[PDB]
Amino acid sequence: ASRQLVLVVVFVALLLDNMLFTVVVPIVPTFLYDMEFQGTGFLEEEITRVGVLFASKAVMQLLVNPFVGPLTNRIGYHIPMFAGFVIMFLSTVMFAFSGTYTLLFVARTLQGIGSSFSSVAGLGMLASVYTDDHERGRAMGTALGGLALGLLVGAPFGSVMYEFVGKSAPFLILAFLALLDGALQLCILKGTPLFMLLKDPYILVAAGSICFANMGVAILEPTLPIWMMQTMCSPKWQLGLAFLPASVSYLIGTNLFGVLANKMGRWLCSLIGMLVVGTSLLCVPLAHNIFGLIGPNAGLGLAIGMVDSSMMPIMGHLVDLRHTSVYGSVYAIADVAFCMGFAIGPSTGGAIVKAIGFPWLMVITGVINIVYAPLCYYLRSPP
Amino acid sequence: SRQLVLVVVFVALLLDNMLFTVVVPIVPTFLYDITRVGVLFASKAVMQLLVNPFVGPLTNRIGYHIPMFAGFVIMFLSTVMFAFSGTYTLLFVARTLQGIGSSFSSVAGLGMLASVYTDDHERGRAMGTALGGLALGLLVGAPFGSVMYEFVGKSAPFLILAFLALLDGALQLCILQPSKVSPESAKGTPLFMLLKDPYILVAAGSICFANMGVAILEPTLPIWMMQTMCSPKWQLGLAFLPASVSYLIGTNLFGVLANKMGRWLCSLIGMLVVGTSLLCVPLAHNIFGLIGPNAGLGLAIGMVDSSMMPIMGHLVDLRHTSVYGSVYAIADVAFCMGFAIGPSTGGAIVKAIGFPWLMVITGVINIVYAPLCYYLRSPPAKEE
Ligand SMILES: COC(=O)[C@H]1[C@H]2C[C@@H]3c4[nH]c5cc(OC)ccc5c4CCN3C[C@H]2C[C@@H](OC(=O)c2cc(OC)c(OC)c(OC)c2)[C@@H]1OC
Numbered sequence: 172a173s174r175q176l177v178l179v180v181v182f183v184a185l186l187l188d189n190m191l192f193t194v195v196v197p198i199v200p201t202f203l204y205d206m207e208f209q210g211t212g213f214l215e216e217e218i219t220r221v222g223v224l225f226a227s228k229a230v231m232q233l234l235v236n237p238f239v240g241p242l243t244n245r246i247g248y249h250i251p252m253f254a255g256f257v258i259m260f261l262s263t264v265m266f267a268f269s270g271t272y273t274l275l276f277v278a279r280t281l282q283g284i285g286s287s288f289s290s291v292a293g294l295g296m297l298a299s300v301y302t303d304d305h306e307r308g309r310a311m312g313t314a315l316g317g318l319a320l321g322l323l324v325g326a327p328f329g330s331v332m333y334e335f336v337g338k339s340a341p342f343l344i345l346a347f348l349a350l351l352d353g354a355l356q357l358c359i360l361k362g363t364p365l366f367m368l369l370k371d372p373y374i375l376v377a378a379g380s381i382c383f384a385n386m387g388v389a390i391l392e393p394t395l396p397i398w399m400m401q402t403m404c405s406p407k408w409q410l411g412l413a414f415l416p417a418s419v420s421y422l423i424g425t426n427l428f429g430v431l432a433n434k435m436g437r438w439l440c441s442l443i444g445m446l447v448v449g450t451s452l453l454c455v456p457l458a459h460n461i462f463g464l465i466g467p468n469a470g471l472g473l474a475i476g477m478v479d480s481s482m483m484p485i486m487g488h489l490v491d492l493r494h495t496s497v498y499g500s501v502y503a504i505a506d507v508a509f510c511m512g513f514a515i516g517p518s519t520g521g522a523i524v525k526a527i528g529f530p531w532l533m534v535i536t537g538v539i540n541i542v543y544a545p546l547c548y549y550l551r552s553p554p
Numbered sequence: 555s556r557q558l559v560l561v562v563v564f565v566a567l568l569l570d571n572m573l574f575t576v577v578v579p580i581v582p583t584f585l586y587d588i589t590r591v592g593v594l595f596a597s598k599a600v601m602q603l604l605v606n607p608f609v610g611p612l613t614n615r616i617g618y619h620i621p622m623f624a625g626f627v628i629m630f631l632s633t634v635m636f637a638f639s640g641t642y643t644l645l646f647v648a649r650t651l652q653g654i655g656s657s658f659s660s661v662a663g664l665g666m667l668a669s670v671y672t673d674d675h676e677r678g679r680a681m682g683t684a685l686g687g688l689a690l691g692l693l694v695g696a697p698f699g700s701v702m703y704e705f706v707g708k709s710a711p712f713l714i715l716a717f718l719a720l721l722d723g724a725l726q727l728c729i730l731q732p733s734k735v736s737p738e739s740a741k742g743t744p745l746f747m748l749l750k751d752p753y754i755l756v757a758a759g760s761i762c763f764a765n766m767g768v769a770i771l772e773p774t775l776p777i778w779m780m781q782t783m784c785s786p787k788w789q790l791g792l793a794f795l796p797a798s799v800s801y802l803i804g805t806n807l808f809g810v811l812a813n814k815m816g817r818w819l820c821s822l823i824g825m826l827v828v829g830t831s832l833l834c835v836p837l838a839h840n841i842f843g844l845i846g847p848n849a850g851l852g853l854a855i856g857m858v859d860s861s862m863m864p865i866m867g868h869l870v871d872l873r874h875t876s877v878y879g880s881v882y883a884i885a886d887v888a889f890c891m892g893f894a895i896g897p898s899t900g901g902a903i904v905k906a907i908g909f910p911w912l913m914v915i916t917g918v919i920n921i922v923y924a925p926l927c928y929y930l931r932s933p934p935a936k937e938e
């Protein structure tokens with residue numbers, strides 16, 4: 172038993188969860204196309220079902236999140252964290268062996284439940300082990316940065332491994348990685364609830380801005396590979412690689428603007444990020460080849476990095492100024508924004524792409540971001 | 555012969571707008587020996603706005619030479635009337651005459667530049683350099699009048715402008731040859747049909763909104779500076795210098811980049827930047843804090859102007875017949891509406907609701923209107 176082991180376990184758990192999220196982007200549409208049969212343009216019939224499939228994780232996470240915390244209070248943190256590995260292993264095995272649309276729905280729902288349990292239990296365990304109030308910041312920083320490395324090699328790893336080795340390869344590799352995390356875990360050893368924190372407009376504005384800045388990438392996942400196969404005729408292994416700018420630019424932007432945003436005001440960073448997101452989403456559906464997406468996607472990643480680096484300290488300051496704040500207060504509010512975005516984006520986006528064209532959806536999202544952008548002026552100098 | 559026409563329009567806009575800004579140092583102090591003075595300055599925008607619809611249709615039947623020569627004559631008469639008049643009612647009329655001359659010169663010159671230059675990119679370059687000349691006139695005019703009123707007298711700068719206008723008229727007579735009435739063979743679209751085109755309306759609205767955003771901020775800033783910052787008198791003019799300098803740089807630099815980057819993207823980014831700059835202007839607590847937002851405002855306005863001037867001729871070439879008088883009359887009306895509305899009602903609006911809410915409203919309007927420039931990406935052509 173040691174303090175570093177819990178850090179390594181939480182690191183591997185969050186990495187596996189985000190990797191399993193991001194590796195299902197270029198495999199589900201390709202798998203659904205290959206079973207039926209560049210190719211044909213029948214994917215518009217199934218775009219609604221593919222959109223509804225991606226929202227299952229967000230909906231299940233939003234449902235099961237309120238019940239986790241009292242459960243961790245009652246029976247501790249180690250037992251609920253172990254359930255996350257079991258559910259993630261079951262989901263990753265069912266993904267590899269699934270052949271029909273029904274099983275992938277169950278896989279996504281199970282992944283949502285396991286992700287919620289693993290995240291809450293791991294953060295609680297890290298808070299419990301470290302009790303110095305200054306090393307806790309470094310530990311939380313490393314654990315949350317584990318999401319970035321997990322995000323970076325997740326999306327262009329299923330696409331590359333799909334066309335060369337097989338469809339059961341990446342899921343089996345993730346399963347073997349998840350099994351190693353459980354082996355390490357075996358050798359181990361209050362104020363202002365969330366519904367009151369969403370009753371003041373200063374926090375609702377920030378949460379909505381985070382959600383609307385992340386919806387641009389939330390609704391770009393299920394609809395971009397189908398668009399690529401329909402119009403640009405790219406090979407099946409470049410669909411994942413078309414998302415690499417959205418990760419690398421996001422990491423660069425979050426580093427630079429976490430360093431630099433305090434000098435020029437956080438609200439200005441948020442406003443410029445939302446405007447850049449809107450312009451990039453507008454410029455996305457004009458490309459006629461794969462190389463035309465290296466610019467708009469990079470801008471989208473940079474702008475989302477701007478918003479996500481300038482908004483979290485604002486929420487922390489707002490919670491400290493007017494309420495009683497704990498270690499996980501900012502995390503809970505941010506999680507609802509991401510989950511709400513991933514649950515509302517794809518489900519409506521599929522219906523919009525069926526009813527009207529794909530470019531109109533991007534235009535709508537860009538207009539929404541631009542219109543919401545002026546409202547960040549409220550966040551300066553809160554009382 | 556196509557290069558020298560740019561020189562004629564360059565000098566014509568340089569001299570006409572120079573008289574626009576030279577008056578401001580010299581008239582408010584001279585009458586003393588606020589609303590009365592402000593309504594004087596807005597007479598040019600109002601009268602030039604009305605004469606514009608009667609200039610566009612006239613250009614088909616007369617040509618682009620007679621209106622420009624008439625504008626030169628009216629400008630010379632206005633500057634001579636300024637140089638000798640010594641009362642309020644004799645200074646109102648000269649401003650009205652200068653407005654008429656400015657309307658003639660702007661519409662005729664931009665139409666002639668559009669007709670001489672046919673390629674879209676090469677026309678964008680010329681319109682960029684002409685707007686650069688206008689910006690240089692605006693920048694140079696005020697200190698010129700202030701220095702030669704402090705040191706030499708009142709009647710000196712107007713007489714010097716009269717001599718320069720005579721030289722411009724000599725150059726015009728040598729180059730343009732304004733001696734006969736030449737009717738254009740093409741019968742252009744009527745001015746009421748062009749207003750039913752959504753794209754022309756979008757372009758005119760973008761120009762009007764950006765210019766209104768600057769035109770409200772121009773007269774209503776010194777009062778706020780006095781009431782909050784407590785700054786001396788000599789910093790008032792220096793506050794707005796970055797806007798003029800950045801506008802000159804932007805209008806000389808973005809005419810080249812608008813074609814490469816895309817007109818709609820340049821206009822969108824300009825409107826967003828002008829909205830953010832106006833939104834951040836009311837937050838400064840000293841003179842040094844207004845350097846950034848004013849420069850951003852000038853750059854954004856240069857972006858919008860250089861992007862949306864050639865777009866009018868492009869739309870008229872794509873959809874309607876190739877006669878460029880009426881569309882640039884519409885563009886000049888969009889230019890002049892902001893200055894017509896700003897000085898007259900800015901004090902009333904500020905006393906009614908407050909300066910920061912005015913800035914917030916203008917910025918939010920620009921930001922919301924910014925998405926509508928996407929519609930100018932590729933307008934459909936007319937049926938063959
Ligand atoms: C699924 O992706 C995620 O799940 C993460 C990202 C969401 C989003 C995203 N998805 C993509 C999927 C792609 O596939 C093709 C490609 C590109 C992207 C991008 C680019 C843009 N990107 C941003 C990522 C943000 C991550 O969240 C945090 O970094 C974070 C940090 C904190 O510390 C301050 C928190 O505490 C307050 C916190 O609270 C909940 C969250 C978030 O969750 C961990």
Ligand SMILES: C[C@H](N)Cc1ccccc1
Pocket residue numbers: 765768797798801851852855889
């Ligand atoms: C030429 C612009 N419509 C007016 C302006 C622009 C920039 C600065 C000051 C004034």
